[PDB]
Design a protein around this motif. Structure first.
Motif, short mmCIF file in Angstrom:
data_model
loop_
_atom_site.label_atom_id
_atom_site.label_comp_id
_atom_site.label_asym_id
_atom_site.label_seq_id
_atom_site.Cartn_x
_atom_site.Cartn_y
_atom_site.Cartn_z
N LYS A 47 -36.64 29.22 -6.90
CA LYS A 47 -37.47 28.27 -6.14
C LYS A 47 -38.82 28.90 -5.97
O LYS A 47 -39.00 30.12 -6.09
CB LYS A 47 -36.93 28.02 -4.72
CG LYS A 47 -35.48 27.69 -4.60
CD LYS A 47 -35.07 26.36 -5.23
CE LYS A 47 -33.61 26.06 -4.90
NZ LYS A 47 -33.25 24.69 -5.34
N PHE A 58 -35.35 25.61 1.35
CA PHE A 58 -34.61 25.47 0.10
C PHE A 58 -33.10 25.46 0.36
O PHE A 58 -32.60 26.15 1.26
CB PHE A 58 -34.95 26.62 -0.87
CG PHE A 58 -36.43 26.70 -1.19
CD1 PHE A 58 -37.04 25.73 -2.01
CD2 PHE A 58 -37.22 27.76 -0.70
CE1 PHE A 58 -38.42 25.79 -2.31
CE2 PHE A 58 -38.60 27.81 -0.98
CZ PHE A 58 -39.20 26.84 -1.79
N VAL A 59 -32.40 24.69 -0.45
CA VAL A 59 -30.95 24.70 -0.40
C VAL A 59 -30.41 25.25 -1.73
O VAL A 59 -30.70 24.71 -2.79
CB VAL A 59 -30.36 23.28 -0.16
CG1 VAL A 59 -28.84 23.36 -0.04
CG2 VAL A 59 -30.93 22.67 1.09
#
Ligand SMILES: [Cl-]
Ligand SMILES: [Cl-]
Ligand SMILES: [Cl-]
Ligand SMILES: [Cl-]
Ligand SMILES: [Cl-]
Ligand SMILES: [Cl-]
Ligand SMILES: [Cl-]
Ligand code: NA
Ligand code: NA
Length: 125
Positions: A47, A58-59
């Motif tokens: 990411k 973010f996941v």
């Protein structure tokens, strides 16, 4: 080398890991942050934030059942047109990370589903 404020949460029921890049301070520039997820020693996800408040969540999907062989690498980079962006500083959180990342990571494993924010010193990278 500067400091980076990150929050982490191990959402173990879904096997996700949420990561917030909040902010940097005392950087030595057009900063952004790249985030790499490693399973053992292979990068399985990456990411990056826009280009120093970052405030970005973010996941990550964790492909295994626990965080034992997972590590997260944060790179603070200086964006510059017409050359390779220079790594201003680096942070690794994981089960055998130096000390900083280490204990933040341990706490994440110890308190699943809690968001835990912490300031870390950046290293050379
Ligand atoms: Cl301070
Ligand atoms: Cl990059
Ligand atoms: Cl990279
Ligand atoms: Cl890349
Ligand atoms: Cl914001
Ligand atoms: Cl995401
Ligand atoms: Cl802290
Ligand atoms: Na992911
Ligand atoms: Na560049």
């Amino acid at each position: 080398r500067g400091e980076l404020l990150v929050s982490l949460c191990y959402q173990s029921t879904t096997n996700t890991l949420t990561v917030v890049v909040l902010k940097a301070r005392h950087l030595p520039s057009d900063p952004y942050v790249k985030v790499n997820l490693y399973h053992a020693k292979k990068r399985i996800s990456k990411k990056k934030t826009h280009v120093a408040v970052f405030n970005e969540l973010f996941v990550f999907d964790i492909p295994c059942e626990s965080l034992e062989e997972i590590s997260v690498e944060f790179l603070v980079l200086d964006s510059e047109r017409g050359s390779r962006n220079e790594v201003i500083g680096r942070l690794v959180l994981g089960a055998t990370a130096e000390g900083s990342g280490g204990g933040h990571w341990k706490e994440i494993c110890d308190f699943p589903r809690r968001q835990i924010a912490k300031w870390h010193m950046l290293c050379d990278g």
